[PDB]
Amino acid sequence: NLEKELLDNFKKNITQYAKQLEISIEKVYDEKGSVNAQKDIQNLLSEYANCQEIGEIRFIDKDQIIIATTKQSNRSLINQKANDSSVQKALSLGQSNDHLILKDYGGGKDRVWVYNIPVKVDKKVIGNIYIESKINDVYNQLNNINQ
Amino acid sequence: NLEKELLDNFKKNITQYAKQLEISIEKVYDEKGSVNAQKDIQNLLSEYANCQEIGEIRFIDKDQIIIATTKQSNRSLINQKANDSSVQKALSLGQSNDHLILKDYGGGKDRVWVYNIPVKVDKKVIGNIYIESKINDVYNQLNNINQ
């Protein structure tokens, strides 16, 4: 049961951390309005992306536009359509979702856990937090102890 | 409630991982006796110490002799008495225990979580697994998101 346990723990870590980022963004919108708030999202994303187990965080608005990313090498993504079904699902239903992907960052295809949590202000979706998290770390550490 | 959640998740990772180590050592004892399974323990501790969040693992026998360490800087600890109250408590109660310490590994005093879990064969304590774990990482992560 160790694999299940460590994977659940990893995913719980990511989702609770991500819930706090969502709360933070909501509160900046509450306090400042959309125009002046959208300018503080980058700093919050950058803070939270300094967690070890997070490969990337993006913030995507109601119209599926990538408003901010934490990975500098992805700066050309800003103002592009996310074109992402899981993001669209999160925006439409107002509910979080997740899936596993395989992604090559330059080391070979790695298992990555994608987590989406929509941001709600006054109960309406304003955007979505998209997180790539390095769940392969858990797989590796299980492999290291032959579990 | 995020600080409590992340601290709890961290401790759950360490304890579930340590339970698998405890199982592994017990099974080597089971199969090979104690005069043929007291030389493979080191390899199991060395595998488990690849966990990036563990600072050290020690295995300590019934008579409180440090049998094995994963820290090369601490080889001289081997064959000495542990002289540790929490280890004594785990051996005598036959249950796990834990406490926080401050330890300076070279970078200043860091918060470290110490976890003990006794090893039981034939329902008797034959020893104890002592773990120092890098819970400081969690505090730092919290401080980086102002939580």
Q: Quick check: helix, strand or coil at residue B71? A: coil
Total structural domains in chain B?
A: 1
| CA nearest to B143 within chain A | A47
CB contact under 8 A, A47 and B146: yes
Give strand pairing partners of B127. B61, B119
How far is it, in rounded angstroms, from Cα B54 to Cα B6? 16
Q: Quick check: helix, strand or coil at residue A43? A: helix
| CA nearest to A17 within chain B | B2
Q: What is the resolution of this structure in A?
A: 2.0
Structure tokens at B55: 């600072």
How far is it, in rounded angstroms, from Cα B139 to Cα B108? 15
Structure tokens at A68: 């901010």
**Whether A142 contacts chain B with CB within 8 A:** no
DSSP string over A17-38: HHHHHHHHHHHHHHHHHHHHHT
Contacting A residues, span 2-31, partner chain B, CB-CB under 8 Å? 2, 5-6, 9, 12-13, 16-17, 20-21
Residues of the domain holding A147: 1-147
How far is it, in rounded angstroms, from Cα B25 to Cα A122? 54
Mutation for testing the A interface, residue in B4, B6, B70 having most A CBs under 10 Å? B6
Give strand pairing partners of A115. A98, A131
